[PDB]
Amino acid sequence: VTDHGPRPFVVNIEDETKRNRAFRRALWTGDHLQVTLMSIQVGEDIGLEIHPHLDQFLRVEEGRGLVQMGHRQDNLHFQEEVFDDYAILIPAGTWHNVRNTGNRPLKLYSIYAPPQHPHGTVHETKAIAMAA
Amino acid sequence: VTDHGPRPFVVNIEDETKRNRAFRRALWTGDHLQVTLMSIQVGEDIGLEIHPHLDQFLRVEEGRGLVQMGHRQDNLHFQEEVFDDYAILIPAGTWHNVRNTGNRPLKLYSIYAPPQHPHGTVHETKAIAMAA
C-alpha cells in the first residue's frame, strides 16, 4: 500500500485495512477526500481531536472500540461501542476520540473530507503521529 | 434508515447497505461529506456521469460489478471488476459508470465529498433518479 491518489483506483479495502499495521497510512489522497488506514494497538486511542473544517467517516473492519464525542471537549456525552461492520460519522466541529477496548488491534479506515494529511503520510506508531 | 446528518452517528453499515433496496438512499448528509446507500438491480448500471467538483468513494458490500472510468466520455479505458470487500475511488473530473454484472442486486455505499444530493434524498428506482 502506497498512496494512489488522485488516480482512478479499485482496491480490496477489507484486506488492506486488516493487513495494515501502521497507526496511520494514507491509501488515497485526492483533491476532495482522503482515505487512511489505521491499526490501533490494544489499550490505545487515536487521541482526542476536533476538526472544524472537515467531516470524517470511519469504518471498523476488525476489533472493538469505544467512540466518544461531544460538543465540548469537557463533555463527551456521546459514548458508543463500535465493532466489526460499524461506521462512525464525525461531523466538523465535534470533539472525538476512538479507543481500542478489545483484545487485538483495532483495524479501521478513515475518510476525511476535505483531506487532512499530506499525500503519502505514514505514521507507523501513535508516538510518531503525535510528534508530527 | 433516514438521513442522520449532521449528527454524531454510529451505524452498522454492512447491515444497512445489504438491507437497503432503494437505488439511492441518503444515510448521512453533513457539511463536507455525504453517505448514500445504493442497491443496483441485475443488469442495471448507475449511469455514466462526471462530477468535476467532488471525489467519490464507493464500497461494495455484496455482489459483483464492472467499474468503467476515463478521462474522456468516449474512452473509458479503466475497466475493472469489483466484488464484495472492494472500494472504488472516483476522482473529480473522471467519467465513470458502475454496472451490475452479477446474479443478485449489487449493494454498495457511496461517499461524496463535498455532498451531491439533498439531505434525505431517496430515489427508490433508477427511473426515479434519472427523472430527478
Tab-separated table of N, CA, C and O in Angstrom, chain B residues 7 18 20 23-24 30 35 37 42 66 75-76 83-85 95 105 112 119 122 130:
chain	number	residue	atom	x	y	z
B	7	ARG	N	-25.517	14.670	12.434
B	7	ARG	CA	-25.330	14.209	13.814
B	7	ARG	C	-24.083	13.343	13.959
B	7	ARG	O	-23.776	12.541	13.089
B	18	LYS	N	-26.677	-3.787	3.008
B	18	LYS	CA	-27.243	-5.007	2.481
B	18	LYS	C	-28.777	-5.024	2.544
B	18	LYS	O	-29.396	-5.620	1.681
B	20	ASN	N	-30.815	-2.286	2.453
B	20	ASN	CA	-31.409	-1.254	1.622
B	20	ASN	C	-31.788	-1.803	0.250
B	20	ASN	O	-31.035	-2.531	-0.377
B	23	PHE	N	-32.496	2.341	-5.067
B	23	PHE	CA	-31.416	2.708	-5.968
B	23	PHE	C	-30.461	3.690	-5.265
B	23	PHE	O	-29.226	3.536	-5.364
B	24	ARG	N	-31.032	4.707	-4.588
B	24	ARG	CA	-30.219	5.636	-3.802
B	24	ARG	C	-30.989	6.078	-2.574
B	24	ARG	O	-32.136	6.506	-2.686
B	30	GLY	N	-23.702	15.606	5.721
B	30	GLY	CA	-23.025	16.598	6.502
B	30	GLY	C	-22.727	17.833	5.682
B	30	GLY	O	-23.177	17.996	4.527
B	35	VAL	N	-23.034	10.276	2.778
B	35	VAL	CA	-23.087	8.826	2.595
B	35	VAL	C	-24.439	8.448	2.032
B	35	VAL	O	-25.475	8.828	2.607
B	37	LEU	N	-26.659	4.973	0.244
B	37	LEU	CA	-26.740	3.545	0.060
B	37	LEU	C	-27.346	3.337	-1.305
B	37	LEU	O	-28.293	4.019	-1.668
B	42	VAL	N	-29.953	-6.378	-11.037
B	42	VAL	CA	-29.313	-7.196	-12.030
B	42	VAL	C	-29.513	-6.581	-13.416
B	42	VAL	O	-30.618	-6.192	-13.761
B	66	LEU	N	-18.873	-4.083	-12.628
B	66	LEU	CA	-17.829	-3.626	-13.564
B	66	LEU	C	-17.781	-2.111	-13.447
B	66	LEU	O	-18.790	-1.440	-13.655
B	75	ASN	N	-13.888	7.349	-24.070
B	75	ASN	CA	-12.826	6.368	-23.874
B	75	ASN	C	-12.663	5.941	-22.445
B	75	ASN	O	-11.790	6.450	-21.713
B	76	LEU	N	-13.517	5.023	-22.000
B	76	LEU	CA	-13.473	4.563	-20.605
B	76	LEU	C	-12.473	3.409	-20.506
B	76	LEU	O	-12.813	2.223	-20.474
B	83	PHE	N	-15.963	-6.589	-6.509
B	83	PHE	CA	-16.654	-7.620	-5.745
B	83	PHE	C	-16.834	-7.165	-4.341
B	83	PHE	O	-16.381	-6.099	-3.930
B	84	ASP	N	-17.508	-8.007	-3.562
B	84	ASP	CA	-17.591	-7.830	-2.165
B	84	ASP	C	-16.215	-7.503	-1.603
B	84	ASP	O	-15.242	-8.137	-1.996
B	85	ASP	N	-16.157	-6.496	-0.741
B	85	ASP	CA	-14.956	-6.060	0.009
B	85	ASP	C	-14.162	-4.961	-0.736
B	85	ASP	O	-13.171	-4.463	-0.228
B	95	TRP	N	-14.874	10.562	-15.811
B	95	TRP	CA	-16.134	9.993	-16.249
B	95	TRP	C	-16.179	8.560	-15.678
B	95	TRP	O	-15.159	7.859	-15.678
B	105	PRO	N	-28.858	-8.336	-6.760
B	105	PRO	CA	-28.598	-6.896	-6.645
B	105	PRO	C	-27.223	-6.574	-6.074
B	105	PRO	O	-26.713	-7.294	-5.192
B	112	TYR	N	-19.734	10.922	-1.082
B	112	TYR	CA	-19.436	12.077	-1.919
B	112	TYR	C	-18.789	13.171	-1.070
B	112	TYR	O	-19.245	13.430	0.052
B	119	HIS	N	-30.206	16.636	1.375
B	119	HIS	CA	-30.433	15.887	2.609
B	119	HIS	C	-31.706	15.065	2.448
B	119	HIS	O	-32.737	15.567	1.929
B	122	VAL	N	-34.132	10.168	-1.454
B	122	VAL	CA	-34.460	8.767	-1.734
B	122	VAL	C	-34.918	8.693	-3.167
B	122	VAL	O	-35.884	9.349	-3.570
B	130	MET	N	-33.218	9.127	-12.510
B	130	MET	CA	-32.999	9.755	-13.811
B	130	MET	C	-33.929	10.955	-13.949
B	130	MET	O	-33.495	12.032	-14.338
